[PDB]
Amino acid sequence: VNSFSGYLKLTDNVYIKNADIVEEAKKVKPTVVVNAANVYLKHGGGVAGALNKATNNAMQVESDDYIATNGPLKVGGSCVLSGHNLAKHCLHVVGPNVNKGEDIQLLKSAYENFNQHEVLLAPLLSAGIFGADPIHSLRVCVDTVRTNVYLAVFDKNLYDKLVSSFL
Numbered sequence: 007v008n009s010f011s012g013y014l015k016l017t018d019n020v021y022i023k024n025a026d027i028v029e030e031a032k033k034v035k036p037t038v039v040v041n042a043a044n045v046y047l048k049h050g051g052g053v054a055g056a057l058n059k060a061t062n063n064a065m066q067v068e069s070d071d072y073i074a075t076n077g078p079l080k081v082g083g084s085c086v087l088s089g090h091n092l093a094k095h096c097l098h099v100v101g102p103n104v105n106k107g108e109d110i111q112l113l114k115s116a117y118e119n120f121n122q123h124e125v126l127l128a129p130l131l132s133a134g135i136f137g138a139d140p141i142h143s144l145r146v147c148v149d150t151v152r153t154n155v156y157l158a159v160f161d162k163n164l165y166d167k168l169v170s171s172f173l
C-alpha cells in the first residue's frame with residue numbers, strides 16, 4: 007500500500023491522474039519524482055520549470071554543479087539528484103524533444119530509466135513542450151515500465167482523452 011490517491015488504474019503497474027505534479031509531489035513526498043529534463047538540466051519551462059520554481063531554484067543550482075562536473079546527459083538518459091522539498095530524489099530523465107528533431111525511438115530508452123526505481127511519480131515523457139504525441143508516450147510507458155508508476159497529467163482535457171483512448 008502507498009499514499010497515492012485518486013488514480014485510475016490503467017494496468018498492473020501504471021496509474022494515471024489529472025493533477026499538477028508539483029502539487030502532487032508536495033502532498034505525497036514520494037521517494038522519486040521524475041523531471042522532464044533536457045541534457046543541460048536547464049529547467050526553464052514545462053514540467054522542469056515548474057518543479058524548479060517550486061524548489062526556489064535549488065534544483066537549478068544543484069543541476070548546474072552536476073553539469074559542471076559530469077557534462078551533459080544523453081537523450082534517453084537520466085541522473086538521480088535531490089528531490090529538495092518535493093521528494094526524496096528527483097530522477098531527471100531526458101526524453102527526445104521533437105521540436106529539436108530528436109529520434110522518437112529514444113522515448114523507450116528514456117522510460118527504461120524508470121525501471122531502476124520501484125515506485126515513481128512522473129509526467130508523460132516527451133509530452134507538452136517536448137512535442138511528442140502524449141497518447142504515444144502513454145503507450146510506450148505502459149509497454150516499457152515494469153515498476154509502479156503514478157502519472158500526473160496537468161491538462162484535464164488531455165487526461166480525459168488519454169483515458170478514453172487507452173487500449
Ligand SMILES: O=C(Nc1ccc(C(=O)N[C@@H]2c3cccc(O)c3C[C@@H]2C(=O)O)cn1)NC1CC1
Pocket residue numbers: 026027028029051052053056129130133134135140158159160161164
Ligand atoms: O506549474 C505547475 N505545474 C506544472 C505541471 C506540469 C506542467 C507541464 O508542462 N505539463 C505538460 C503539459 C502542459 C500543457 C499541456 C499538456 O498537454 C502538457 C503535458 C505535460 C504534462 O501534463 O505532464 C507545467 N506546470 N505548478 C505550480 C504550483 C502551481
